[PDB]
Every structure is written in C-alpha cells, then in structure tokens.
Amino acid sequence: VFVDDHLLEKVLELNAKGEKRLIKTWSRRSTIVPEMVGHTIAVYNGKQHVPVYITENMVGHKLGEFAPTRTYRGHGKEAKATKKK
C-alpha cells in the first residue's frame, strides 16, 4: 500500500488552496486516501486518462480499479443503465 508522492503532493496543494482541478496520473497502483475525496483524478489506462470523481467508498482501493481500458465492446451496450446519480 502506497500513494504516489507526486499525486499526493498535488492533492495536498489543492486542498490548501481550496481549489478543485483535474489531476492527471499514470500511477494505477497507488492507493486512494481520504485527502483525495472530492477530487477528480484522471488515471491512465495505457491509452487514455479516465477521470475519477473520488468518493468515500473508493478510499482504500487502487486507482486502477476505476480506469479500465475501452477495449471490450459489449453487445447491447446501449441498453445498459447508469449508476444512480
């Protein structure tokens, strides 16, 4: 378990200013910590940065868990329903 220092530094910096800015990262292994809740982190999946709105529930998980590749095309994909807003 570890948090990419660079990413944490950026997050801490933002929290001190009270700003909310998209943060790009290539660190899929880093674990999500409470200081990241409410931030939008764009995690690299090898081709694109998938944005993640960090919620309390995500604390403890790996960033990679929320940035999958857009590799698979699912049949009837347009009939899927979005997670409740």
Binding site: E19, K20, R21, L22, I23, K24, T40, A42, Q48, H49, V50, P51, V52, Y53, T82, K83, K85
Partner: peptide
C-alpha cells in the same frame, strides 16, 4: 472524458451540462 456522477455534471431532458473545473 467526464464522470457522469461528478457533482459538476447535470443531466437535463435533452442535454447535459458541465461546470468545467480547470483541466
């Protein structure tokens, strides 16, 4: 790319609205 569930994204009948945070 934009998380649908982000608080700065709104869904209306016939359109979607975003209050773009920097970046």
């Amino acid at each position: 790319l934009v998380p649908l569930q982000a608080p700065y994204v709104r869904v209306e009948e016939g359109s979607i609205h975003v209050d773009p945070i920097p970046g």
